[PDB]
Design a protein around this ligand. Structure first.
Ligand SMILES: CCCCCCCCCCCCO[C@@H]1O[C@H](CO)[C@@H](O[C@H]2O[C@H](CO)[C@@H](O)[C@H](O)[C@H]2O)[C@H](O)[C@H]1O
Ligand SMILES: CCCCCCCCCCCCO[C@@H]1O[C@H](CO)[C@@H](O[C@H]2O[C@H](CO)[C@@H](O)[C@H](O)[C@H]2O)[C@H](O)[C@H]1O
Ligand code: NA
Ligand code: NA
Ligand code: NA
Ligand code: NA
Ligand code: NA
Ligand code: NA
Lengths: 319, 319
């Protein structure tokens, strides 16, 4: 369909192609593009060490393509009506757990890793529940309008990423409603050193804090595109251990679920994010040479296992 | 206008964003993008040695952006009606020479370097003359349809890039009509070693052959975008020396005109093309390390000047 493609490329005002070319040109001229590719490949090195160098490149290439594809699909999703987006949901596994958790009326925490095409699940979810979501305003103003408009359409209640937003989320849960937390980025402020692929990383405790206090039901969700179709969406109950222990133990149970998802579907995780920076030993690992980076990481995964048998709280010390 | 941009990005079918992402992904995954950037910078090294390293990067970056911009503008031009494209011509310098050459009824050869946004001149030119143009079918089939459709709309007579097309062009000129030759690429088959920025390069003789035999008028044409507007188009008569000597002497006069254009507007030449490969000493200069490449080129620009004082035809020998 290269032609109906060009047929609309060529139908738009000429300043549109100009604006798009300057955007691409900025990327080709900043080396932001090849910096991304090496971060993906370093991340795969760290999280999936058993890949051959041949398998890494194959997954790196599918991941580059798949993450890029998801952002375009996000645009399509955000510019589409709710019914169109709901119709994009081809199949759902585990729908039962979602309606059941709604039935319990103790709240629902949807745990969504940066994986596949998660934005497509919102319109479908929103027809069964009120949704309250953390929202960081987007730097550029028109992107923020375009996203806020799409959230307005999907009925989402946006709250600030601060304590007042957390309070509104707690309130939403206590009223039997739903929240979506993306738990797998490094928090801007704080928090807890929790192992991620064997590496202690500064991690959010928000999901566990919400769940363990309110006894809300925790569901693990992700959606993967089907070749020239819509998306299969997967709803899985979080292991009941998430309710036990400290918030950090709950966060660790969330980390295990993400790891298992990544193990099965490494090409569908969004590897561009520089997650493994979030350790005081690892602040520079994306700047330095990858093979030294990996020596530092391997150094650290070993210390952390040896220090966990030791009575001393070494890895969770934040300094 | 980032929003009305996204407003149509998001209005298209989701498989459209998918197709576009796979295209980008292919480029980021092939290193075709950073290969292009080093070819541009090597070309500027060769043709514009007086640039500081600081000035090169600035022009490299504007050239990357400007060549990319021209291809998007070509799409817009090819998908636009003739009147829309004519309206995109903001100003014309030297229109007089064009109507006068048409008046002489000995034919008109429009010499168009790969520079700026040349496709925008066609619709304007075609309202005064019949145009016959060499056409190589585009590899991909829908691109070929999209381009052939645009040429059909612009009234262009397409002829094959072989002797039969050259014959049709000669016939068109003898009937007082017009042809457009892009003279500044390396021919697929043959031809003559003519200095380009001091470097003997295998070059087309077609423009000079046409002009010197038929006594058609030769015009030098180029168009440059105006910041968020259309394009200024420039029509300049070729130096009368183009009629003198051999076809290769005529080609050299064409090369001087392109060099002067590049000197004034280096950011508007399409530097991605690997022009300086076209010498038996230079076949690998884009693969090797640029600083050795440039030693080989500097070696060659010196030999060529020393051999031109020598009675021996060294540089024009093809082996
Ligand atoms: C017009 C250009 C074409 C767009 C195609 C590629 C654009 C994507 C590149 C940006 C890369 C990551 O960019 C990141 O995107 C996410 C969504 O995933 C934005 O996220 C924003 O919307 C999402 C979804 O409601 C929320 O989770 C978040 O709170 C909010 O800030 C981030 O603000 C931005 O940092
Ligand atoms: C949908 C993708 C978006 C397109 C944006 C970028 C695409 C451009 C990248 C291609 C780079 C150079 O690509 C080159 O383009 C020229 C036009 O300049 C094509 O040229 C084709 O049309 C032109 C114009 O009628 C003729 O001069 C030529 O005889 C014909 O083959 C070449 O066949 C192709 O080799
Ligand atoms: Na692992
Ligand atoms: Na969404
Ligand atoms: Na703890
Ligand atoms: Na020069
Ligand atoms: Na044209
Ligand atoms: Na000669």
């Amino acid at each position: 369909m290269n032609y109906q493609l060009l047929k609309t490329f060529s139908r738009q005002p000429i300043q549109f192609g100009r604006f798009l070319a300057r955007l691409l040109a900025g990327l080709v001229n900043t080396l932001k593009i090849t910096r991304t590719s090496k971060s993906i490949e370093l991340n795969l090195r760290i999280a999936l060490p058993y890949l051959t160098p041949q398998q890494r490149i194959a997954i790196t290439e599918k991941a580059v393509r798949n993450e890029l594809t998801s952002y375009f699909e996000f645009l399509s999703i955000w510019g589409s009506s709710n019914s169109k987006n709901i119709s994009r949901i081809h199949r759902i596994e585990g729908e039962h757990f979602f309606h059941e958790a709604l039935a319990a009326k103790k709240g629902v925490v949807l745990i969504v890793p940066h994986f596949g095409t998660w934005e497509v699940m919102n319109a479908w979810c929103a027809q069964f529940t009120s949704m309250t979501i953390l929202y960081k305003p987007v730097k550029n103003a028109d992107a923020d309008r375009f996203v806020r408009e799409a959230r307005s359409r999907e009925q989402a209640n946006l709250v600030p990423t601060d304590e007042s937003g957390v309070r509104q989320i707690f309130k939403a849960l206590k009223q039997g409603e739903t929240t979506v937390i993306l738990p797998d980025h490094t928090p801007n402020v704080g928090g807890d050193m929790v192992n991620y692929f064997g590496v202690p990383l500064a991690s959010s405790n928000l999901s566990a804090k919400l769940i363990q206090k309110t006894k809300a039901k925790a569901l693990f969700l992700y959606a993967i595109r089907n070749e020239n179709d819509g998306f299969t969406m997967h709803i899985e109950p979080m292991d009941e251990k998430i309710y036990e222990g400290t918030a950090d133990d709950g966060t660790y149970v969330i980390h295990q679920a993400i790891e298992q998802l990544i193990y099965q579907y490494p090409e569908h995780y969004h590897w561009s994010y520089k997650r493994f920076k979030a350790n005081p030993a690892l602040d520079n690992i994306y700047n330095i040479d990858p093979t030294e980076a990996l020596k530092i990481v391997d150094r650290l995964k070993a210390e952390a296992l040896k220090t966990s048998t030791q009575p001393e709280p070494i890895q969770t010390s934040v300094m």
